[PDB]
């Protein structure tokens, strides 16, 4: 026959196919977006690491504080640099703590939380330095290194958390599975309703 329910059921097939396509397409989009970040992080080695020298270069860089709502606040801070041992190079390389720090100023080992007062960023860098200054010959850190591209830079932290990576690939797969269930339940309803209609 034809039936009254055909319009809603065929629209339900169009939705289920659009979700299958959108699941696969967003999987490729996130695939290319995460390709360079995921390789650039997961190619970094994990190593045991020990401090071997510390110093200030006798010169200052500028950070920018924010008040909240439209401030620039450009303010000087001491440039402290720290050199560390690692299992691959076994030689002098500059510690940068987090990746962001390296990307924003690789000549210093730290950037303080920038503030309206020069004195607070000075004492913050002193309060940070007096830790790594005493860690000379201490029990090893665990730290990250990249011999293929960064033979003289060292990191304390990863470039991204695996949670945000996982969520970007979970919801495309869930979208695809939901689309498949909509297609299957709709085709099941269409093909079973005609058996019930003949059996009535």
Partner 1 sequence: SRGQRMWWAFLASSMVTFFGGLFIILLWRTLKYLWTVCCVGWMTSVKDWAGVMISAQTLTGRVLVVL
Partner 2 sequence: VNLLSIFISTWLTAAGFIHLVENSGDPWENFQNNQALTYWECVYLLMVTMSTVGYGDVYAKTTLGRLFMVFFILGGLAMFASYVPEIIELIGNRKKYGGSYSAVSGRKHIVVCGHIT
Ligand X SMILES: CCCCCCCC/C=C\CCCCCCCC(=O)O[C@@H](COC(=O)CCCCCCCCCCCCCCC)COP(=O)([O-])OCC[N+](C)(C)C
From the list a copy of itself, ligand X, partner 2, none, which binds 17 (C-beta under 5 to 8 Å, kind-based)?
Answer: ligand X
The residues that touch ligand X, with contacts defined as CB under 6 A, are 14, 17-18, 21, 25, 28-29, 31-33, 35-36, 39, 164, 167-168, 171
Total chain residues near a copy of itself (CB under 8 A) = 17
Establish how many alpha carbons lie within 13 A of residue 174's alpha carbon, considering only the half-sphere containing its beta carbon. 6
Q: Checking phi first, is residue 96 left (phi over 0); if not, alpha (psi -120 to 50) or beta?
A: alpha
Q: Cβ of residue 177: shortest distance to a copy of itself, in angstroms?
A: 37
The residues in 54-113 that bind partner 2, with binding defined as CB under 8 A, are: none
Burial class (CB in 10 A: 0-12, 13-18, 19+), 145: buried
Question: Does residue 17 touch partner 2 according to CB under 8 A?
Answer: no
Locate all alpha helices (DSSP H) within the chain, ordered by sequence. Answer: 6-42, 99-104, 118-132, 162-199
What is the binding site for partner 1 (CB under 8 A)? 5, 12, 178, 181-182, 185-186, 188-189, 192-193, 195-196, 199-200
């Amino acid at each position: 026959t034809v039936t009254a329910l055909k319009a809603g059921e065929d629209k339900s097939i169009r939705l289920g196919l659009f979700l299958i396509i959108s699941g696969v397409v967003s999987l490729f989009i996130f695939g290319f977006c995460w390709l360079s970040p995921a390789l650039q992080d997961l190619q970094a080695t994990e190593a045991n690491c020990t401090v071997l020298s510390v110093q200030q270069i006798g010169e200052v860089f500028e950070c920018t504080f924010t008040c909240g709502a439209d401030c620039r606040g450009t303010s000087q801070y001491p440039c402290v640099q720290v050199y560390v041992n690692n299992s691959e190079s076994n030689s002098r390389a500059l510690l940068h703590s987090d990746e962001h720090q390296l990307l924003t100023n690789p000549k210093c080992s730290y950037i303080p939380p920038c503030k309206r007062e020069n004195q607070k960023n000075l004492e913050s860098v002193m309060n940070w330095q007096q830790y790594w200054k005493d860690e000379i010959g201490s029990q090893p850190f665990t730290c990250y290194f990249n011999q293929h591209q960064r033979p003289d830079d060292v990191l304390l932290h990863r470039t991204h958390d695996e949670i945000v990576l996982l969520h970007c690939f979970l919801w495309p797969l869930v979208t695809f599975v939901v689309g498949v269930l909509i297609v299957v339940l709709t085709i099941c309803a269409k093909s079973l309703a005609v058996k019930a209609e003949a059996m009535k």
